[PDB]
């Protein structure tokens, strides 16, 4: 699972090296940056249902056709699963903020996603709109410090780009 430290460790192992100067430096960056992304991680943990709800709302508002007969938001099951999905991505982003690398989102969110949505005729635009709404939504210092919002937003764009 990719983080600052697993990345320098994997590269060191590939060359049969002990951790050296640049490996310790790298991890000090993870030390430096942890406050910002853990603040984001804690804020997101405390408020994930609300954040996910309003992103979900926004994507259905953008695309009301999803509510039409036989479309992907048309039943109670489907509505519940769509919100769950939005939540999944946000929880995986909470994980990535904790880890300090895209690892959790890479492995449990992005990998396989396009296959899954293809197989089930799930349009990807509503996913992108849910995440884009959440990306444009936060502001500092109301929601979190500016550097914490930077981390939050960076992982949202990373998720967005993975679908784009």
């Amino acid at each position: 699972m990719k983080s600052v430290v697993t990345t320098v460790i994997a590269a060191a192992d590939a060359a049969g090296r002990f951790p050296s100067s640049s490996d310790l430096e790298s991890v000090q960056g993870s030390i430096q940056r942890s406050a910002a992304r853990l603040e984001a991680a804690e804020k997101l943990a405390g408020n994930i249902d609300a954040v996910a709800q309003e992103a979900y709302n926004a994507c259905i508002q953008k695309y009301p056709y999803l509510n039409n007969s036989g479309e992907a938001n048309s039943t109670d099951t489907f509505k519940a699963k769509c919100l769950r999905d939005v939540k999944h991505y946000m929880r995986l982003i909470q994980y990535s903020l904790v880890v300090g690398g895209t690892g959790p989102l890479d492995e449990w969110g992005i990998a396989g996603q396009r296959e899954v949505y293809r197989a089930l005729g799930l349009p990807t635009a509503p996913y992108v709109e849910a995440l884009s709404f959440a990306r444009n939504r936060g502001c500092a210092p109301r929601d979190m410090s500016a550097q914490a919002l930077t981390e939050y937003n960076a992982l949202l764009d990373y998720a967005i780009n993975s679908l784009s």
Partner: protein, 184 residues
């Protein structure tokens, strides 16, 4: 591999929950600089450690360097010195990550079986690992003796606290112990 953080992430995902216990992690952070020192302390002294330990293993059991001994002839001695270095290397990886998975996965997995096939003595390997465990503890605490080191003594010069990083010493030791538990 996992680190201390993705480990907590994995444990949380097992109930599909967010990570809320952010105290141990904050703690991990607050002692981040000490961890880096601890790693620096081992890596910087890795060669002195490895050779002292394998030599220590031999001086306690001359069987290893006699006819039929597993450190005889030269290439076996070289092979053993090599292995000692490999184990120390992965332990230091485990310490830097603050998680044992890289050590379990890339080093220990299938090690006992390998040594069994080769006839590499378990008792002796474990001893060498025990000596490095004692070495690592001393260097992390920055209290190596001149008695064991001589002219090759090294001082790290890290900011001293009273417990001389007792927590990290425990962690580091728990990784060498995973080695020992694996080989026996």
């Amino acid at each position: 591999m996992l680190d201390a953080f993705s480990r907590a992430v994995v444990q949380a995902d097992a109930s599909t929950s967010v990570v809320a216990d952010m105290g141990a992690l904050k703690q991990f952070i607050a002692e981040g600089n000490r961890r880096l020192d601890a790693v620096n302390a081992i890596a910087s002294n890795a060669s002195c450690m490895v050779s002292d330990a394998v030599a220590g293993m031999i001086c306690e059991n001359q069987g290893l360097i006699q006819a039929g001994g597993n450190c005889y002839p030269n290439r076996r001695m070289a092979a053993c010195l090599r292995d000692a270095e490999i184990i120390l290397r992965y332990v230091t990886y485990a310490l830097l990550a603050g998680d044992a998975s890289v050590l379990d996965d890339r080093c220990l997995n299938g090690l006992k079986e390998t040594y069994a096939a080769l006839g590499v003595p378990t008792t002796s390997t474990v001893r060498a690992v025990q000596i490095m465990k004692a070495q690592a503890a001393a260097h992390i605490k920055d209290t190596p003796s001149e008695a064991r080191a001589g002219g090759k003594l090294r001082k790290m010069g890290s900011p001293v606290v009273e417990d001389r990083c007792a927590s990290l010493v425990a962690e580091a030791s728990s990784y060498f112990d995973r080695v020992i538990s694996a080989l026996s």
